[PDB]
Amino acid sequence: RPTFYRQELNKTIWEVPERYQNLSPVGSGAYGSVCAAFDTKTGHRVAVKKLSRPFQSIIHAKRTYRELRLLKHMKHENVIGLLDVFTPARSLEEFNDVYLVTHLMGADLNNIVKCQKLTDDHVQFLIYQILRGLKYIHSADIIHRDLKPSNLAVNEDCELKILDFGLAATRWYRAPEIMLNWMHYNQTVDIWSVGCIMAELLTGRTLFPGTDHIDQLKLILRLVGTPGAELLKKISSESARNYIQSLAQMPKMNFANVFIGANPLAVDLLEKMLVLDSDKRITAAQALAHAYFAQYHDPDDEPVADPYDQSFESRDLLIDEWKSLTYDEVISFVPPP
Ligand SMILES: CC(C)n1c(Nc2ccccc2F)nc2cnc(Oc3c(F)cccc3F)nc21
Numbered sequence: 512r513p514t515f516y517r518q519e520l521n522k523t524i525w526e527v528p529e530r531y532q533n534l535s536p537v538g539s540g541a542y543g544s545v546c547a548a549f550d551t552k553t554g555h556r557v558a559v560k561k562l563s564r565p566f567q568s569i570i571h572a573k574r575t576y577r578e579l580r581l582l583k584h585m586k587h588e589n590v591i592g593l594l595d596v597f598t599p600a601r602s603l604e605e606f607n608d609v610y611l612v613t614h615l616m617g618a619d620l621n622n623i624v625k626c627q628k629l630t631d632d633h634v635q636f637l638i639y640q641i642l643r644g645l646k647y648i649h650s651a652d653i654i655h656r657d658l659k660p661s662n663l664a665v666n667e668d669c670e671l672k673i674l675d676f677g678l679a680a681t682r683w684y685r686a687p688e689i690m691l692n693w694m695h696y697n698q699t700v701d702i703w704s705v706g707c708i709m710a711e712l713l714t715g716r717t718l719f720p721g722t723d724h725i726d727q728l729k730l731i732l733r734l735v736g737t738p739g740a741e742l743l744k745k746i747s748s749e750s751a752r753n754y755i756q757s758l759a760q761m762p763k764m765n766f767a768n769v770f771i772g773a774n775p776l777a778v779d780l781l782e783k784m785l786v787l788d789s790d791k792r793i794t795a796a797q798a799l800a801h802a803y804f805a806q807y808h809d810p811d812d813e814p815v816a817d818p819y820d821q822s823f824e825s826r827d828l829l830i831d832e833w834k835s836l837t838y839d840e841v842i843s844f845v846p847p848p
Contacts, residue, residue: 512601513528513529513530514528514529515527515528515529515599516529518534520534520536520544520546521536521544523544523561525546525559525561525610526599526608527548527559527597527599527610528597529551530550530551530552531548531549531550531551531557531559531612532548532549532551533547533548533549534546534547534548534559535547535548537558537678538678538679539678540563540676540678540679541563542562542563542574542578542676543560543561543562543563543676544560544561544563545558545559545560545561545678546558546559546561547559547615550594550612555614555615556614556615557594557595557612557613557614557615558612558613558614558615558616559610559611559612560610560611560612560613561608561609561610562575562578562608562609562610562611565607565608565609565834565837566607566830566833566834568830569827569828569829569830569833572830572833572834572837573823573828573833575609575833575837576823576833576836576837576840577823577824578611578675579596579609579611579837579840579841580823580840581653581675582596582611582613582675583596583840583844584651584816584817584819585647585648585816586816586817586847587643587644587647587648587814587816588643588644588670588672589640589641589643589644589647589671589672589673590644590647590648590672590673591613591614591664591672591673591674591675592613592847593611593612593613593844593846594612594613594614594846594847595610595611595612595844595846596609596610596611596612596840596841596844597610597612597841598610598841603834603835603838606834606837606838606841609837609841614672616664616665616666616670616671616672617664617665617666617667618664618665618666618667619660619661619662619663619664619665619674619677619678620637620660620661620663620665620671620708620712621659621660621661621663621677623660623665624660624715627715628715629712629713631713631773631774631777632806633669633712634709634712634713634777635777635803635804635806635807636669636807637663637665637669637671637712638705638708638709638712638804639799639804639807639808640670640671641658641663641671641673641705641708642705642795642798642799642804643795643799643813644671644672644673645673645698645701645702645705645795646795646796646799646813646815647814647815647816648673648701648816649698649701649794649795649796650815650816651815651816651817651818651819652698652819652821653816653819653821654697654698654700654701655673655701655704656689656700656701657681657684657685657704658673658684658701658704658705658708659677659681659683659684659704659708660684660708660711661677661678661679662674662675662676662677663677663708664677680721682721682723682724682727683707683717683718683719683720683721683727684703684704684707684708684719685700685703685704685727686699686700686703686704686789687703687728687731687787688700688789690724690727690728690731691724691728691748691750691751691754692748692751694747694748695745695746695747695789696789697789697790698794698795699789699792699793699794700789701795702784702792702793702794702795702798703784703785703792705784705798706718706781706784706785707719707785709777709780709781709784710770710781710785713770713772713773713777714770718734719731719734725754728754728755729758731787732755732758732761732787733761733764734763734764734769734785735763735764735785735786735787736761736762736763736764736787737755737756737758737759737760737761738755738787738788741788742787742788743755743756745788745790766778766781766782766785774803776801776802776803777803779801779803780793780798780801780803783798783801784798796813799813823836
């Protein structure tokens with residue numbers, strides 16, 4: 512066991528290995544707090560996240576386990592993965608804190624609206640990297656479900672990694688089919704969000720700034736138009752069918768209009784990402800093969816993930832069971848070279 516030191520940072524004790532120096536708060540959430548630090552082993556800067564109250568409840572405990580399992584699996588250039596995982600606990604019985612370590616990027620995509628705007632080449636590069644990361648995640652049968660600019664960590668080289676949770680509205684970037692319920696959807700819900708993000712990078716404006724879930728649907732249909740019979744027939748919920756139809760009727764807009772100026776290949780890709788019908792939306796793999804990315808696409812370097820076991824998601828276990836499972840995963844961690 513390495514030597515650990517303690518430090519108070521904004522009202523909580525951080526207890527970390529001496530290896531991590533110059534802890535500097537980046538920010539917080541409901542699920543945890545993150546400090547930048549210097550890793551003396553590598554001479555690289557890292558992000559250290561201290562989970563907030565990991566075994567407060569079965570929902571905290573299961574989320575803690577899910578986060579550790581996910582982060583241990585992700586091994587891709589465009590997805591945040593794990594450099595280290597530690598606890599000051601020397602046994603199961605004293606295990607109440609979990610810390611996770613990743614490479615520090617320095618900013619997120621949303622705090623790149625500082626830039627004033629991006630050239631088409633920069634949009635191509637950033638969206639290419641998101642889609643490359645999503646290909647990999649999606650291939651493990653994982654769906655992000657909350658992709659937004661604050662979930663995309665970007666360094667000064669414009670390299671990008673997908674985060675599970677960022678600092679800091681979800682609904683602005685959420686797909687219409689999961690706006691009211693979770694009955695009929697797939698991994699392309701993340702593609703919708705990528706479309707929304709791409710639009711905002713090209714435009715400097717949030718595409719669909721809805722004030723609530725029904726206003727959100729309203730703004731969405733104003734762009735893509737009210738659905739025809741072929742989509743309405745797949746909506747189970749009489750409540751959802753009625754909101755969609757009760758707008759009035761709206762023509763699909765000309766994306767060449769709303770995105771004039773843009774590379775028409777960008778516009779064409781957007782029209783394929785922002786398809787209302789979940790079953791017809793382009794996948795991450797299909798999107799990477801689009802001509803918009805001809806400068807970056809290489810099918811030989813767009814890997815898929817090893818098989819990921821998410822059977823635990825179906826399980827209803829006791830806080831102590833989630834906690835033991837989490838502990839095993841901490842003990843079994845092997846750092847990358
Ligand atoms: C701040 C937080 C969202 N965060 C995480 N979280 C995290 C997730 C899983 C395991 C360990 C972790 F520390 N890793 C980060 C890497 N890089 C950056 O960069 C920044 C930035 F420095 C300031 C603001 C926005 C960012 F994305 N943020 C990271």
